[PDB]
Write an enzyme that holds these catalytic residues in place. Structure first.
Site, mmCIF file in Angstrom:
data_model
loop_
_atom_site.group_PDB
_atom_site.id
_atom_site.type_symbol
_atom_site.label_atom_id
_atom_site.label_comp_id
_atom_site.label_asym_id
_atom_site.label_seq_id
_atom_site.Cartn_x
_atom_site.Cartn_y
_atom_site.Cartn_z
ATOM 1 N N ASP A 121 0.783 -1.222 0.031
ATOM 2 C CA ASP A 121 -0.099 -0.101 0.111
ATOM 3 C C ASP A 121 0.907 1.207 -0.115
ATOM 4 O OD1 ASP A 121 -1.978 1.878 0.536
ATOM 5 O OD2 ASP A 121 -2.352 1.651 2.330
ATOM 6 N N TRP A 148 4.298 -5.587 8.109
ATOM 7 C CA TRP A 148 2.960 -6.403 7.948
ATOM 8 C C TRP A 148 3.363 -7.488 6.847
ATOM 9 C CZ3 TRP A 148 3.921 -2.242 5.473
ATOM 10 C CH2 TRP A 148 3.546 -2.012 4.209
ATOM 11 N N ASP A 183 8.427 -0.314 5.508
ATOM 12 C CA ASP A 183 8.470 1.068 4.965
ATOM 13 C C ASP A 183 9.819 1.675 4.950
ATOM 14 O OD1 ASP A 183 5.789 0.727 4.224
ATOM 15 O OD2 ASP A 183 5.092 1.548 6.057
ATOM 16 N N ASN A 211 -2.665 -3.174 6.223
ATOM 17 C CA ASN A 211 -1.876 -2.401 5.315
ATOM 18 C C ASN A 211 -2.089 -0.787 5.179
ATOM 19 O OD1 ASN A 211 -3.281 -2.091 2.994
ATOM 20 N ND2 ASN A 211 -2.276 -3.710 1.928
ATOM 21 N N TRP A 233 3.572 1.506 8.803
ATOM 22 C CA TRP A 233 4.604 0.734 9.668
ATOM 23 C C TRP A 233 5.755 1.326 9.629
ATOM 24 C CZ3 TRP A 233 2.646 -2.469 12.910
ATOM 25 C CH2 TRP A 233 1.424 -3.252 12.325
ATOM 26 N N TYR A 241 5.637 8.544 5.616
ATOM 27 C CA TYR A 241 5.740 7.261 4.703
ATOM 28 C C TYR A 241 6.265 7.682 3.424
ATOM 29 C CZ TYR A 241 4.580 3.967 1.404
ATOM 30 O OH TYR A 241 4.656 2.890 0.404
ATOM 31 N N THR A 281 7.621 1.515 -0.065
ATOM 32 C CA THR A 281 7.782 0.116 0.690
ATOM 33 C C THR A 281 8.517 -0.617 -0.039
ATOM 34 O OG1 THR A 281 5.449 0.324 1.688
ATOM 35 C CG2 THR A 281 6.155 -1.895 1.520
#
Ligand code: HEC
Ligand code: HEC
Ligand code: HEC
Ligand code: HEC
Ligand code: CA
Ligand code: CA
Ligand code: NA
Ligand code: NA
Ligand code: NA
Ligand code: NA
Lengths: 125, 355, 376, 131, 376, 337
Positions: free
Chosen positions: A26, A51, A70, A98, A102, A113, A116
Site C-alpha cells: 500500500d 506487515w 516501509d 496495510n 508501519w 511514509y 515500501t
C-alpha cells in the site's frame, strides 16, 4: 486494468503494481525513487516493523511470506503508486493490515511514509 | 571414515575417562534426556554446571548441543559483524576446537594436558583399534595427534542426525504434514513480523533450507548479572563477562557484552534461559524484550522476582536499533509466542512440555 | 529494450533461485558525475515540494530531496555537495516562518548542515536558478531578498552560519564570479558588480546600460560560472552575452537566435528555463515556438542551437513534446534535457542529433527547474 | 486550447482561465475555493501588495487596470489553476511581474500562496501594453 | 442550468455597469446547515493534506482547512465547531514530530484552539473516521494510539488541554456514548465498554464475542452518536447493528445487504467509506460491486439502500462513476454523497431517486473521507 | 437661484467684513492663486479645491467614520464648516451670529443679494442671515471653478494625452503600493470624479510640528487628538486620526500634513518609508537630518496599511512625485518646477 478483477501476479517487472511480491503493498514501490526491491532510497530510514502477506510466485508456484517494510522520513515519493490487498485483514488484525504506517523502529524516530520494500521472509504455512 | 568417525565420537561423548577424576562425560552436562543440557541442581539451581572436581561451578549456562552443528565456523563478515563459532562468546572457531577447550578446562572436565588425554585413550583397547583405523598406527602415542583426533571424532558425532533431527511440530507443519493451532499460527506470524525475526532467523531475506532460528551473530541484549550463579562461579563481584570480546584475538571494545544468538530449537525444554541462566521460565525470557518497548511500569519488573530486571552487566553496545521496536507485546502475543516456540521442540522431547 | 524494472525482476528471481541473501538497508546514490541531473518541482506554489535526483544516462531516479515552499536549489560544480534555501511554517502554510539552508552529501543525501536564516529573509517567487547562487569555491551561498528592498544574503557554508545582508541598488539575480564578488542585473539596464567584505557596505560599480527599457530580459538567463559567461535572451530571442572571466563585464556582440523572417512569422522563445549553454562547445540552446508576444511562459516544441561566437545556427530540433525548460550536461557528447511541467516528465535527448533517448515521468506536480554540475 | 495562440478574453465565466479580468493572473482563482471574484476565502489573509495588468474587457471595449491581490496563509488551493501573462514583464519590472508571491502586507505575516482575486482599480493602459 | 462561474460573471458585469463598489475582504462561510459536507484528502500519504468545506445544495466549495500528515477530522453534530488531530515535522517529513488538535470556528474557519499532544501519541494510519471522536456534548475529543500498545488519548476541548492516555485492551476504534464512556472493537470479536475518569484505571467491560475470527469487520463502520446506532458491515456485506443508546450494547438482528444470488455472482461491498446510515429514515446505504474477494478497497459503482429494521432492500442505484466513499445528509429528503478518490470529485445525488444532481471536482490529490453534521 | 446663490457666496468669500476686525476674508488663507491655500493656528490650511466632492460626515456600516470637513471632521459638510470658521477664534473669529448679520446689513449689495434669494428682512434675523451666508459660501465652493477636473491626469484618463514614462511608472506605483488603500475614492471599480481620497480618518503617526505648535499658543502640553475632538465622538479608537486629504493639487499646496510639518512633497512621500524600510536613513527626516519624531498620538496607528513590507527606493519616489504633479489643475501648471 479492471480494478475489481482478481489480481494476477507476474514475475517480470518490479515497477508494476501486478509484480507478484506487491500482493499487499500500500503506497509506492521503493525501486521507483532510488531504492531497490528490497532496499530503501538514500536519505530515508528503514523501519523495523512489518506487515505480512502470503504472495504467490508464478515463477515457481510457491507462496512466500513478504514482510513489507516501509522507508520513512520523507514525503510520499509519488512514483509507482500501488495498492493491493491480497489476504489483507482489517486493522484489528494488524499483522495483516496495510493502511497502517508501519514506520516503527525506523532510525531517528522517522514516521512519514515514503515507499515500501518487498523482501521475502519465509514460505507460507 | 564418516560413520566410523561419528561412532568413535559417540563412545567418547559418554566416556567419563575424558575427565580428570573420571566423574563426568560430555553427557553429564549435555544429557540426551534433556535436549543435551544439564539437569543437575548446583549452588545456583540449573543456571550453571558443576565440573569434574565436584566443586567448581561455571559462570555460564550449559547450552544444548542440538543443531550446534549447523553453525558456521567463526568469521568476520564483510560488514564487520562476527558470526558463527562455538561457546556463548564464540571463543572456539568450530565444534572441533570447542571439544579440546572443554576437555582441558579446569572448571569443567579438567584434564591436565594433552598427554593426559592421550594416556586415557591408550588405556582402552577399543580406542586403540578405533583411533588407529581412522588416523593411523601410533596416533595415540602422539599426544597432539591423539587429542586432535578425539576432538575431531566428538565434532563428527555432533554433526549426525540424532543431534539435528528437524522433526519438531514446526518442521512437520512446514512440510505440510500438520497445521498449527490458531494460537501457534498467531505466534508464528508475530515471530516473523516483530523484531524477533531480525536476530532469530538464519537469513535476512529469502528462505533458509535448515532454519535454526538464529542468525549466528553476536548481540548484547542488556542482561543483568545472575547473582546466584556469579556467586557460585567465584569470579568475584567486580567480574564482567565481556562475551565476544573475551575471545582471544578479538580486541574491539564494541564487542564487549555481545553473545552468540542461540538457536531457539528446543528452547521450551532447555531452561533456565540466557547465557547465565538468569530466567527460569520461557515466558520471562520473552517478557524481557518488552523492557525496551513498553511504557508500563510492570515492563521493567522481572515477574520471577518482583524486582527490576537489573542494570545490564555491560551497558555499552546494546542492540538498541533492533530492540527498541516501538511496539509492546501484549499478553495475547506473549501467549502466542510461547505456543509457537513450543512447536520448535524435537519430537522426542514433546513429553517434557507437560512439566 | 529490457527496462530497469524487468532487469530488476530478473536479478531478484536469480537471487531467490540461488539462495543469495542480502541485507535490507539504505542505498547510497552512485557517485555524482557529468550525467547526473536534478529536477526541482515547485509544485505550482504548494507549501512542500520535491527535488528528484536522476542518472541521465540510465534515465533513473536515484534519490530525492524534500523541500518547503518555493526552495532554491544549487549544485556544486565539482560534485562535492548540493544545497537549497528553503522555507517552512509551523502549521503547514500558516504560523511562524523559518527559512534555512541545507547542505547535503550528494551520495547519502543526508543533510550535513542546516543553517537558519534570521528574520525570514528569502525571496518567495516562482523558481529562478540565479536567485540563489554559490561562489566558485563553494564556501559561500548568496540568496536574493526582495522585501523590504533588493538585498543579498551571505551564508557561510564552511562555518555553517548566516553572515549578513548586503544592501544593493534596484537590481535582480546573483552571478558570482569570485569568493567576494557577484553581478546583478539592474532595472536601469546596467549590471552592478558587487564586491563584499567581512564588514562594510559592499563596493558597487555599474556597467554601461546594455539594453533599452523596451527590450525585456527573461527571468531565466544561463550562467556558466566556470566560463564567466552570462547568456541572456530577450522576449524576441536576441541574446546578450556578457563575459565576466576577467572579473569585469565585457559585452560580447549581440546574436539573434531567430531570423528576421522567423520573427515576422511569429517565432519567439517561450517557457521557463528557455536557454542552456554548453561551456566546452561554447554553444547556445533556446526553446522557441510560434506564439503571440504575451504567451512567453507557455511550453515550446522546438530548440535552436547556435554558435555563441558567430551566432550561426547549428541546429533546429522538433522536440516532440510541450517543453518548458531545457539544460545540458557539460561533458563531451552532451545530453539535452527537456522538462515538461504539464507532463511531469523529463525527456532526455542527444544534444547533437536532438533525438529523444529516454524519459523519466512522475516527477511530482509541476516540475520546472533542471540543474547539472559542470564537473570537467 | 492552443496555449501559444493570442489569448481571447470572455466575460461569461469567472472560473475559466480566459475570463477577461484574469489576463495576468498566476495561481488559482479564489472564487473556486470559497472566495469570490474580488474576496478571499475564509481562513486566508488578504495581501495589501499587488501586481497590475491592463485587461481588455470585450463586453464594453474598455481596458481596465486589474490590481491582483493574493489570498495568503494557506497551501495552494489546487482548484481553477491559471497562468496568463498579458503585458507581463520580467521580475526587474515587478509592478508588472507575476511569478512573485505578492503576499506582502497580509495579516499575521502570511506569505504562502492560496489563490488570487481580480478586482478592477482603474480604466487605463500602459505604454508597453495597450489595446 | 447557468453555472456558478457564469452567474458570478453576470453579477460582476452588472456591478461594473452600475458602478457598484464593494470592499475586497475575507469572506465568512455561510452558517453550517444540514447540507454542508466536508471532504478530507489524505493525499495518498503526503506529508500535508487538505479538507474542503462544501455547500452540498449549491455544489460549491465554501472553504478549506489545511492539515498535516494523515489528520483525523471531526465535526460537532450541532454545527458549533469542527476539529482535527494532526501531525507536522520540523523539516517537512523529517525532524521533530508535533501532534496537536486544532478546533476551528465553522464560519471564519479560524482555529480557536491548538492543543499539543505530548509524546507524539497519534496513530498514523490511512484515515478512519472513528479513530478520533467527539463525545456527545462536544467537550472531549478521544483519539486512538497504537504504539507501543492500544490506548486512547483524552483531550479536553473545553479547557483546551491534553488530559491523559487510558490503557485499553487489544481493541480498535472509539464510539463515544457519554461524556465519560465509549466503546471499542476488540481483536477477540467483542466490543469493550470503557468508562473513564480523570485519574484511575478505567472500568472496562466486554460484550459477548459477536463475530468469529474469519468474519472481517471493515475499518469504516457508520456510527450515529445521536441514535447510538453502530452499523458494521463485513467483507461480504453482512451488516451488524449494535444499539448503544441505553449505555450498554444491545444487539439487533444481523441483515444482508446483498442477496444470496448476488453473493454467488461475486457481489461484495468495497471501497473506503463503504457504508452510511441515515438516522431519521433508519436506512443503510452500502457501496457494492462485482469484485474478487480481495479487491475490497477498490471503488464501486452501485449503492444498495436497505431498511435497517427489516433488512428489506429499498433501492439499488447505479452511481455512474468509480465511487470510494459515501455518506448522507441527515435532513428530511437527504443528499447521498459519493466521493471518487480517482476522479478527485464529490458527486452529489438525490438519496431517494439516486439521481446525480451536481458535482464538485478538483478535491485534492486523493480525497477519501466525507463527514456531515447531524443537526436535527 | 443656483448661479445667483453661488455669485453671492463669491462676494462673501473675498469680503474681510466677515472677520472680527475686518482684517481677512476666506481668500486671505485660501488664495485662488495658490489652489485655495495660504501663500503667506495649530493646523495647516487645506485646499478648498475638490472639497465639495467630500460626503457629509457619517459612520459607515462597518464602524468607520467618513466625510465631513476640517482635518478632524468636526463639521458635517461645507455649509456647517462655513458657519464654524466664521465664528472660530483661530480663523474669522466673529463674536456671534448677530455680529455677522450686522456686517451684512451694512452693505447695500448684500441687502439686495440676500433678500432676492432668502426673502425680505432675512438680514434682520441673525440666525437666518448667518445660515444664508454659510449656505451661499458652500454653494460657491461647489462650483466647477473649485473642482474643474482639468489636470493632466484628467486629460490622460480621457484619452486626450499620455503620461510620460516617469509619470506612468508613478501612477503604477501609486495604484499597486499602499497609497491606493487610502488615497482613492473607492475600493475597486472606477471613480467618476476621483479625488484621491477615501474620505476616511487615519492616524499615520505624525510627530508634532515644534515650531508651529510653539507659534499656535496652544501650549506644549497640548495634544491634537484629531477626530476624537469632534463633538459627539467619544470612541477612544478615533484619537489621533485625521481626514485623508485629496492629493489633487498636492504639488502646489505645501507644506504638508495636518500640521504643515514637511515643507517638501518628496519628504511627505519618504515619511511612509519609516514603516517599511530597514535602512538607517529611513529613520531620518531629510529636511532636518534628525529622526522624524515619536507620534504625537501613539495609538490607533494604521499599521495594517502602513507596514506594507515594501520600501520605496529613490527611483519610485521620483516616479510618485512625477505622478502627483499630474494631479495639478490646468491653471496651476505654471506653478510647477
Ligand atoms: C561441566 C559441564 C560440562 C561438560 C562435562 C561439557 N560441557 Fe559443553 N558446555 C558447558 C558450558 C557451561 C558451556 C557454555 C560455556 C561457555 O559458553 O563459555 C558448554 C558449551 C558447549 C558447546 C557450544 C555450544 C554453543 O552453542 O555455543 C559445545 C559444542 C559443547 N559444549 C560440547 C561439549 C562436548 C563435546 C563435551 C565433552 C567433550 C562437553 N561439551 C562437556 C558445560 C559442559
Ligand atoms: C537484537 C537481536 C535479538 C532480538 C531482536 C531478539 N533476540 Fe532473543 N536472543 C538474542 C540473543 C543474543 C540471545 C542470548 C542473549 C544472552 O544470553 O546474552 C537471545 C536469547 C533468547 C532466548 C533465550 C534462549 C536460550 O537458549 O537461553 C529466547 C527465548 C529468545 N531470545 C526469544 C526472542 C523473542 C521471542 C524475540 C522477539 C520478541 C527475541 N528473542 C528478540 C538476540 C535477539
Ligand atoms: C485665518 C486663516 C483662514 C481663514 C480666514 C479661513 N480659513 Fe478655511 N481653513 C483654515 C484652517 C487652518 C483650516 C483647517 C482647520 C482645522 O482643520 O481645524 C481651514 C479649513 C477649511 C475647510 C475644510 C477643508 C478640508 O478639506 O478639511 C473649508 C471648506 C474651509 N476652510 C473654508 C473656509 C471659508 C469658506 C472661509 C471664509 C468664511 C475660510 N475657510 C476662512 C484657515 C482659514
Ligand atoms: C493608512 C492610510 C494612508 C496610506 C496608506 C497613505 N496615506 Fe497619505 N495620507 C493619509 C492621511 C490620513 C493623511 C493626512 C495625515 C495627517 O495630516 O494627519 C495623508 C497625507 C498625505 C500627503 C500630504 C497631503 C497634504 O495635503 O498635506 C501626501 C503627499 C500623501 N499622503 C501621499 C501618500 C502616498 C504617495 C502614499 C503611498 C506611499 C500614501 N500617502 C499612503 C493617509 C494614507
Ligand atoms: Ca538454557
Ligand atoms: Ca498644505
Ligand atoms: Na539466580
Ligand atoms: Na579478546
Ligand atoms: Na516646523
Ligand atoms: Na469628542
Amino acid at each position: 486494468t479492471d480494478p475489481r478483477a482478481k489480481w494476477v501476479p507476474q514475475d517480470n517487472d518490479i515497477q508494476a503494481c501486478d509484480y507478484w511480491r506487491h500482493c499487499s503493498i500500500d503506497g509506492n514501490i521503493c525501486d521507483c525513487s532510488g531504492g531497490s526491491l528490497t532496499n530503501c532510497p538514500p536519505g530515508t530510514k528503514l523501519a523495523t516493523a512489518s506487515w505480512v502477506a502470503s504472495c504467490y510466485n508464478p515463477t515457481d508456484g510457491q507462496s512466500y511470506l513478504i514482510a513489507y517494510r516501509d522507508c520513512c522520513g520523507y514525503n510520499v515519493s509519488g512514483r509507482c503508486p500501488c495498492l493491493n490487498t491480497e489476504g489483507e485483514l482489517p486493522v484489528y488484525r494488524p499483522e495483516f493490515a496495510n493502511d497502517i504506517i508501519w514506520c516503527f523502529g525506523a532510525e531517528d524516530d522517522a514516521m512519514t511514509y515514503h515507499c515500501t520494500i518487498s523482501p521475502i521472509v519465509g514460505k507460507a504455512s | 571414515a564418516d560413520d566410523a568417525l561419528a561412532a568413535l565420537g559417540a563412545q567418547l561423548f559418554v566416556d567419563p575417562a575424558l575427565s580428570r577424576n573420571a566423574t563426568q562425560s560430555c553427557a553429564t552436562c549435555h544429557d540426551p534426556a534433556r535436549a543435551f543440557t544439564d539437569p543437575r541442581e548446583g549452588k545456583a539451581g540449573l543456571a550453571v554446571s558443576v565440573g569434574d572436581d565436584g566443586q567448581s561451578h561455571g559462570d555460564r549456562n550449559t547450552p544444548t548441543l542440538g543443531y550446534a552443528a549447523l553453525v558456521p565456523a567463526f568469521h568476520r563478515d564483510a560488514n564487520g559483524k562476527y558470526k558463527g563459532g562455538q561457546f556463548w562468546d564464540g571463543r572456539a572457531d568450530d565444534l572441533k576446537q570447542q571439544a579440546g577447550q572443554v576437555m582441558l578446562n579446569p572448571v569443567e572436565m579438567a584434564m591436565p594436558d594433552r598427554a593426559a588425554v592421550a594416556a586415557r585413550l591408550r588405556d582402552d583397547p577399543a580406542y586403540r583399534t578405533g583411533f588407529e583405523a581412522l588416523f593411523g598406527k601410533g596416533v595415540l602415542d602422539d599426544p597432539e595427534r591423539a587429542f586432535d583426533a578425539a576432538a575431531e571424532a566428538l565434532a563428527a558425532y555432533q554433526a549426525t542426525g540424532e543431534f539435528s533431527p528437524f522433526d519438531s511440530k514446526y518442521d512437520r507443519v512446514m512440510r505440510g504434514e500438520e497445521k498449527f493451532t490458531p494460537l501457534e499460527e498467531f505466534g508464528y506470524t508475530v515471530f516473523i513480523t516483530w523484531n524477533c525475526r531480525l536476530c532469530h532467523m538464519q537469513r535476512k531475506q529469502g528462505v533458509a533450507e535448515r532454519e535454526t532460528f538464529t542468525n549466528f551473530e553476536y548481540h548484547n541484549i542488556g542482561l543483568p548479572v545472575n547473582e546466584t550463579a556469579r556467586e557460585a562461579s567465584g569470579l568475584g563481584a567486580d567480574h564482567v563477562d565481556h562475551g565476544l570480546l573475551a575471545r582471544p584475538g578479538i580486541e574491539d571494545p564494541a564487542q564487549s557484552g555481545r553473545f552468540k544468538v542461540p538457536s531457539l530449537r528446543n528452547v521450551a525444554v532447555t531452561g533456565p534461559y540466557m547465557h547465565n541462566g538468569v530466567f527460569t521460565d520461557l515466558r520471562t525470557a520473552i517478557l524481557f524484550y518488552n523492557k525496551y518497548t513498553s511504557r508500563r511500569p510492570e515492563a521493567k519488573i522481572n515477574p520471577e522476582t518482583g524486582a527490576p530486571w537489573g542494570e545490564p552487566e555491560v551497558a555499552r553496545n546494546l542492540s538498541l536499533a533492533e530492540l527498541q521496536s516501538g511496539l509492546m507485546l501484549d499478553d495475547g502475543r506473549v501467549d502466542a509466542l510461547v505456543a509457537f516456540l513450543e512447536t520448535l521442540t524435537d519430537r522426542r522431547y514433546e513429553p517434557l512440555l507437560e512439566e | 529494450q529490457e527496462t530497469q524494472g524487468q532487469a530488476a525482476a530478473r536479478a531478484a528471481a536469480a537471487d531467490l533461485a540461488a539462495g543469495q541473501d542480502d541485507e535490507p538497508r539504505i542505498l547510497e546514490a552512485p557517485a555524482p558525475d557529468a550525467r547526473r541531473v536534478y529536477v526541482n518541482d515547485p509544485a505550482h506554489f504548494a507549501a512542500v515540494t520535491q527535488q528528484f535526483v536522476i542518472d541521465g544516462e540510465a534515465g533513473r531516479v536515484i534519490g530525492m530531496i524534500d523541500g518547503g515552499f518555493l526552495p532554491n536549489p544549487v549544485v556544486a560544480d565539482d560534485g562535492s555537495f548540493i544545497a537549497h534555501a528553503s522555507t517552512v511554517f509551523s502549521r503547514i502554510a500558516r504560523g511562524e516562518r523559518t527559512d534555512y539552508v541545507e547542505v547535503f552529501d550528494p551520495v547519502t543525501l543526508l543533510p550535513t548542515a542546516d543553517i537558519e536564516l534570521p528574520d525570514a529573509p528569502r525571496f518567495l517567487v516562482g523558481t529562478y536558478p540565479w536567485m540563489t547562487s554559490l561562489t566558485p569555491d563553494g564556501k559561500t551561498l548568496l540568496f536574493y531578498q526582495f522585501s523590504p528592498a533588493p538585498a543579498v544574503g551571505v551564508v557561510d557554508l564552511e562555518g555553517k552560519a548566516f553572515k549578513r545582508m548586503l544592501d544593493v541598488p534596484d537590481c535582480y539575480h546573483i552571478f558570482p564570479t569570485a569568493p567576494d564578488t557577484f553581478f546583478m542585473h539592474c532595472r536601469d539596464g546596467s549590471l552592478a558588480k558587487v564586491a563584499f567584505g567581512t564588514e562594510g557596505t559592499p563596493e558597487i560599480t555599474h556597467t554601461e546600460v546594455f539594453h533599452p527599457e523596451d527590450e525585456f530580459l527573461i527571468n531565466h538567463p544561463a550562467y556558466s560560472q566556470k566560463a564567466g559567461r552570462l547568456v541572456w535572451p530577450t522576449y524576441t530571442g536576441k541574446i546578450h552575452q556578457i563575459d565576466l572571466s576577467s572579473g569585469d563585464a565585457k559585452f560580447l556582440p549581440a546574436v539573434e537566435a531567430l531570423t528576421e523572417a522567423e520573427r515576422a512569422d511569429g517565432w519567439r522563445p517561450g517557457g521557463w528555463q528557455q536557454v542552456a549553454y554548453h561551456r566546452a562547445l561554447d554553444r547556445i540552446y533556446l526553446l522557441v515556438d510560434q506564439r503571440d508576444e504575451w504567451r512567453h511562459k507557455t511550453a515550446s516544441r522546438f530548440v535552436v542551437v547556435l554558435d555563441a561566437k558567430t551566432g550561426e545556427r547549428l541546429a533546429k530540433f522538433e522536440m516532440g513534446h510541450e517543453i518548458d525548460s531545457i539544460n545540458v550536461s557539460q561533458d563531451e557528447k552532451p545530453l539535452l534535457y527537456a522538462l515538461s511541467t504539464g507532463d511531469k516528465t523529463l525527456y532526455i535527448h542527444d544534444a547533437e542529433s536532438g533525438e529523444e533517448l529516454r524519459s523519466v515521468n512522475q516527477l511530482g506536480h509541476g516540475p520546472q527547474v533542471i540543474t547539472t554540475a559542470d564537473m570537467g
